[PDB]
Each structure stands twice: as structure tokens, then as C-alpha cells.
Structure 1
Amino acid sequence: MKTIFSGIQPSGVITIGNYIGALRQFVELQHEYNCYFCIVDQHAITVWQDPHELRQNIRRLAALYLAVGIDPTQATLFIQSEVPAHAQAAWMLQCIVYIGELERMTQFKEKSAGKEAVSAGLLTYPPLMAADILLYNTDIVPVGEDQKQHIELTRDLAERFNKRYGELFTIPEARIPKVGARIMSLVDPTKKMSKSDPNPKAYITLLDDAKTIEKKIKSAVTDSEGTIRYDKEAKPGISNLLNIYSTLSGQSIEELERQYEGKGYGVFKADLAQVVIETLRPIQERYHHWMESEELDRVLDEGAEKANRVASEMVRKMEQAMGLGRRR
């Protein structure tokens, strides 16, 4: 069995595009793979964070992952800062990465934009991410092309350590098993839907209430043709809505096209709004149950204990290879 590690940024609340692209399939994948889901609060403070908002977003994210079907007895769900091994191994990895390798990172050259003076944490983001992955002998990281450079560095650091001290790390690969449709912004169908869009009409989050879902689908961009047909280059907006509808309803695009022959966009959108609301309502109900239950803290307590068991053993092996500490 292969191991999967997903780091989850707390600040952002899940969009349907994330759910459809890379999260929903994990409800079943968690039984075929050994899955780690890690809320990276330590990565979150590499930029400016309001403390109360960060704490609430950490909890909300855990409750959301449980609400969608992540099973804490099949997968390991935990908060990064509650496993000290991540900080310990990130320091050891800082000691084998070259400064030049960090300065070259594209994400660091961005994010450094209209800031002038930036935190050292933004430069050492990648070693901590490599540590997150490598501590669990991860085989697969479910990320897209925007994280390619970070995965390359992770693979470089694993190989450098293995060749300097002896084989210890698995060399991870970037891959989203059973990847879903790539869902685009409702406002700009050529841009991917993302939780950081400055236009809130661009995304629907898993926590949007019905009125908001209705208004956002209502304003979603289409075209002037009035024909429900998949054509990504000439009808990117309609094509995107067909991808959301198809995956959330279980009907193929061809069947939706046949279904809507002769119909305009008004009735197709009102049907899509209902499909989304019906998808999120159960998730939102279980979510509210988790957020008001003591079982959420107990679940996260054991997630961190089970993660620490694996990661603290890897730290012991790294320290032993590098000369740290004693063996007594």
C-alpha cells in the first residue's frame, strides 16, 4: 500500500472546485491508500495572520474534512504544529538545502511582491514542506503544477540526504489519483476556481448557504447562444457549468446535453443551483455537528498521536544519521 500526504492550508475554506478536483475521491481512496491530511498552521504564519481567525480556520477545516467523509480511523487527520517532528525535521533539512535553491523558488519570488521586506519563514517554506512529506515515507503528494518546483526540491532533498547518509526517505511523486474535472471560476471561465479570488462570485465554498449558492450560480458567466453543449474553447462558461453539474449529479455530459436540448440557460442554472445545494446541505449538517461536538478535539488529539508516532520515529533516524543527541 502506498502513502499519500496532503498538506491543507488553514486560512482558505474549501471551494466546490477543490472538492470536485481533488478531495471528494479521497472518501474512497482512503481505503486503498494510507492517507495523511495535515492542516499546516505552521506554514500559515509565514505571512501575516490574525490569531483568532487562524485558530477558528484550523478548527473549521478539520470539521469540514470530517463532514465530507474523511474517516479518522482510516486516514490520519492532524494539525501540523501539534507534531514537533515537523519543526525538528525542517531544521535538519534547512541544513542540507542550499540558500541558492531557496532564492530560486518561484513562489518565493512571488509572495515577495508588494512587500519589500519579507519574513525568513517565506524563504524556508520549502524545507518545512519537504519535512511534512518526507517524515511519513510518502509515495504520492496530490498537488498540481503550481507545486511542481516544491516537489522537485523535496525529491532533491530526499535524494541528497539518502546519498549522504544512506537510504532513509522515499522519493515522493506529485500525482492526484483519480483526479476530477478542473473547475474554473464562475466569473472568469478561463481561470481556475480558487479560494483566493478577489471576486467572491468566482467560487462557491462548501459553507455557502442556499441564498448565496443561488445568487452565485445566477450570476455565473455563460454566453449568448442559449444552447447547452460542451465546447471548452467556444463556450468555456457553459462547459464549466456542465462539469460541475455532471460530477455532482452523476449524469454524463452527453446525457445532460440530451436532457437540455431545446432549453435555455435560465432553467439549466436553476437546476444546477439545486444540484449544488443538495450536495452541500448534508456536508453542512455534519459540519455543524462536528463544530459543536467534543469528539472533534478527541479526533484531532488522536490524529496527532498517530502522526507523531510515525514522524518522531523518522526524526530519531535522521538525528541518528546526522549525529544529533545520544542513543541512551
Structure 2
Amino acid sequence: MKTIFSGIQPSGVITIGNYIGALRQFVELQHEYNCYFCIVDQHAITVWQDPHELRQNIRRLAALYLAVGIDPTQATLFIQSEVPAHAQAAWMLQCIVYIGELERMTQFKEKSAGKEAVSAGLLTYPPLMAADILLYNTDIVPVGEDQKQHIELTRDLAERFNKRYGELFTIPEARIPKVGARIMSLVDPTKKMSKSDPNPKAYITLLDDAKTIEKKIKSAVTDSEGTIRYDKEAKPGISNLLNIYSTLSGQSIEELERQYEGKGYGVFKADLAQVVIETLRPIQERYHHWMESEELDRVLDEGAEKANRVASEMVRKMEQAMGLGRRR
């Protein structure tokens, strides 16, 4: 079968946007592809991470991957840093990416937007992500609309390497969901929901308690119409709430518009909170199971073992193409 790779940064607790845009689809994709799902801790340090928080976040992410249903025997779950090949191939890839291609990345300009001093890692985020994917001869990359431009660069980089040194890389393809590819901030409907937003009201983590989810849905930005109908341009907050409601409940935006005819934001929000709470319920239960056992560490050990075998061999192939080191 074809191969899949996809990473999530342990830069905070994953949100419903992360879930809706990517994680949710991993669970189904694992049975039809050879999958590598990564906890990208090296990507997470491109900005300040408290060391204790990062360690904890790394373990929580792994538990949540398994809690949503990733089966360690059907897919390879691992931590980026535990596979030296990602840093190796990242170095090689940054000697072929042009500085201008990095500065033109919208994620770079956005995250670097209005900062005096910024880490080089923020800028060199792309070559590492390109290595993450390219290392496993990945065919499909399940994301995550905001990740489209990175995958496009990654393709340019694999092509440049292939034509410069010889055919080595499979050109990967992004797989972005038709629905939920871009869940918006609850607090600023013009920005996507980010797990690292400085405002906790912007997102709902997969670990949020009922009380917390009710508050967050209640504080969500809407408008003064009091009319539940989808209109991304005119009613951004309400349209986003409808999207969340629609993908989580399985009802169409249109069905929800009818069901809420004659209502009623208070009631619409109260209902949506319960829908999110009910979705997160079985997930949180299994998360607690994984968090309290050493089984989590066995899954990760075995996952890094398999990833190392595949990746270090690609690295060897890459060094042989570039002329690095010695003949092996």
C-alpha cells in the first residue's frame, strides 16, 4: 500500500481544530495505508517551550493519539527527536532550500509577525518538516489547510534534490479534508484555532472539562443578528460554530439552520457545548488509561525503533547522493 506521514507539535494540548482537521482522519486512514504519525518535539522548540511543559505535552500527545484510536500495530507512532535522521535530513535539506523560499512562507511571516528577535528555527521550520515527510517515502500527507504551503515547498525540495543528485524521493501529496480543514479561533473568527494561542478562550483542548467547554462556547464571538445561518463573510463566528457543530454531530449546515430556525444563540451555544463535551467524553477516558501505564512508553519505544530503521536508511541514501561521509 501507499505510505502516510503526519506530525503534530507537542506545543500545548491538541485542540478540536487539530482533531477535526487531522487527527480524526488518521484513525480511518491507518487501515488503508502504511502510516507514520509523529510527535514533532523538534518543531515545537522553534519557539519557547517550558521544559517541564514540553515533556508533559509530549506524553499527553502520545496518549491522545492512542485515545482517539490510533492502533500501534496498524501505524507507527513516534517522537521526532528520538529518530536522529530527522535532524540529519533536515540539515541536508536546508543546504538545498533557498533563503527566499523560507522567508516567503506565510507561517514564518505570521508567527514572526511583529517580533523583534526571532529564532532561526522559526525560519528553518520547513526543511525539518520536509525531512519528516521525505524520510519515509511518503505518498500522502494528511493535514491541515495551514500546512498546504509547507507540503508544496517540500515537493519543490524533493524535486530539486532528485534532479540535482538523482531520483531518490517520492513526491508527496497533501490530503486536506473538504470539511473542517480550517477551524477558526472562538475569540477571533479571522484567525485559525491554534493550540498555542496566547488566549485559552480561542480554542477548546481535547482535555478541557465540561465547565470549561461551556464557558468557551459561551464566550465565542458572534454578531448582533441573533440569526443562525451560515455566512463566512458576513457572520464568521456563527459560521465557524456551525461548522464545528456540523462535523461533530454529522448534521449538515443546512439541517442545523432549520433546526435552529426561530432561535436563539444562547440555546445554540448551550447545545454545541454539550455536543463537544459528548464527543470528548470517551476520548478523555481512554486518555487517562494511557497516561497511567507504562504501555505508552512501550508503544513509543517500538515506534521509534521502526522509524529509525526506515529513516536512517533514507539518510544513508541521501548522504550517498550528496557525497557525504564515506562509502558504506
TM-score under structure 1 normalisation? 0.90
Among all aligned residue pairs of Structure 1 and Structure 2, give the percentage whose two residues are the same amino acid: 100
Q: How far apart are residue 108 of structure 1 and its match?
A: 4.1
The DSSP-based 3-state class of the residue aligned with 2:193 is coil
* 1:192 alignment partner in structure 2: 192
Deviates most, 279-288 or 148-157: 148-157
Q: How far apart are residue 145 of structure 1 and its match?
A: 5.2
CA contact (8 A) 1:213 1:273 kept: yes
Tell me, in whole angstroms, the C-alpha distance in 1 between the residues paired with 2:314 and 2:8. 21
The DSSP-based 3-state class of the residue aligned with 1:158 is helix
Tell me, in whole angstroms, the C-alpha distance in 1 between the residues paired with 2:171 and 2:104. 21
Q: Give the direction of change, closer, same or farther, for the CA distance of 1:35–1:225 in structure 2 (3 Å limit).
A: same
CA contact (8 A) 1:103 1:109 kept: yes
Q: CA-to-partner distance for each residue in 1:27-74, whole Å, 9 max, x for gaps? A: 112212222211111222233332111111111111111111122211
Tell me, in whole angstroms, the C-alpha distance in 2 between the residues paired with 1:266 and 1:47. 38
Deviates most, 154-163 or 252-261: 252-261
* 2:63 alignment partner in structure 1: 63
Tell me, in whole angstroms, the C-alpha distance in 2 between the residues paired with 1:111 and 1:68. 29
Q: How far apart are residue 141 of structure 1 and its match?
A: 2.3
Equivalent pairs counted in the alignment come to 328
2:41 corresponds to 1:41: yes
CA contact (8 A) 1:22 1:179 kept: no
CA contact (8 A) 1:10 1:58 kept: yes
Tell me, in whole angstroms, the C-alpha distance in 2 between the residues paired with 1:156 and 1:235. 37
CA contact (8 A) 2:11 2:195 kept: no
Tell me, in whole angstroms, the C-alpha distance in 1 between the residues paired with 2:118 and 2:182. 33
Q: How far apart are residue 302 of structure 1 and its match?
A: 0.9
Q: How far apart are residue 257 of structure 1 and its match?
A: 2.8
Q: How far apart are residue 134 of structure 1 and its match?
A: 0.6
Q: CA-to-partner distance for each residue in 1:112-162, whole Å, 9 max, x for gaps? A: 455544444334332222111110111222345544443333222211221
CA contact (8 A) 1:17 1:182 kept: yes
CA contact (8 A) 2:136 2:310 kept: yes
Q: How far apart are residue 196 of structure 1 and its match?
A: 3.1
2:177 corresponds to 1:177: yes
Tell me, in whole angstroms, the C-alpha distance in 2 between the residues paired with 1:271 and 1:92. 51
Q: How far apart are residue 281 of structure 1 and its match?
A: 1.2
CA contact (8 A) 1:25 1:178 kept: no
Tell me, in whole angstroms, the C-alpha distance in 2 between the residues paired with 1:223 and 1:116. 35
Deviates most, 105-114 or 224-233: 105-114
Structure 1 runs not aligned, ≥5 long:
none
Deviates most, 242-251 or 143-152: 143-152
Q: How far apart are residue 7 of structure 1 and its match?
A: 1.9
CA contact (8 A) 1:7 1:39 kept: yes
Deviates most, 148-157 or 271-280: 148-157
CA contact (8 A) 1:13 1:206 kept: yes
The DSSP-based 3-state class of the residue aligned with 2:222 is coil
Q: How far apart are residue 110 of structure 1 and its match?
A: 5.1
The DSSP-based 3-state class of the residue aligned with 1:114 is coil
Tell me, in whole angstroms, the C-alpha distance in 1 between the residues paired with 2:106 and 2:192. 19
Q: How far apart are residue 214 of structure 1 and its match?
A: 1.2
Q: Give the direction of change, closer, same or farther, for the CA distance of 1:44–1:226 in structure 2 (3 Å limit).
A: closer
Q: How far apart are residue 106 of structure 1 and its match?
A: 4.6
Deviates most, 23-32 or 107-116: 107-116
The DSSP-based 3-state class of the residue aligned with 1:24 is helix
Q: CA-to-partner distance for each residue in 1:171-228, whole Å, 9 max, x for gaps? A: 1223325543632222233332222333322221111101111111222233334333
Deviates most, 226-235 or 64-73: 226-235
Tell me, in whole angstroms, the C-alpha distance in 1 between the residues paired with 2:240 and 2:106. 29
Deviates most, 74-83 or 266-275: 266-275
Q: Give the direction of change, closer, same or farther, for the CA distance of 1:318–1:196 in structure 2 (3 Å limit).
A: same
Deviates most, 259-268 or 70-79: 259-268
CA contact (8 A) 1:181 1:243 kept: no
Deviates most, 282-291 or 149-158: 149-158
CA contact (8 A) 2:184 2:240 kept: yes
Q: CA RMSD in A?
A: 2.4
CA contact (8 A) 2:144 2:181 kept: no
**Higher Rg of the two aligned structures:** 1
Q: How far apart are residue 297 of structure 1 and its match?
A: 0.3
* 1:159 alignment partner in structure 2: 159
Q: CA-to-partner distance for each residue in 1:277-298, whole Å, 9 max, x for gaps? A: 1111111111111111111000
Q: How far apart are residue 104 of structure 1 and its match?
A: 4.8
Q: How far apart are residue 263 of structure 1 and its match?
A: 3.4
Q: Give the direction of change, closer, same or farther, for the CA distance of 1:86–1:277 in structure 2 (3 Å limit).
A: same
* 1:106 alignment partner in structure 2: 106
Deviates most, 248-257 or 198-207: 248-257
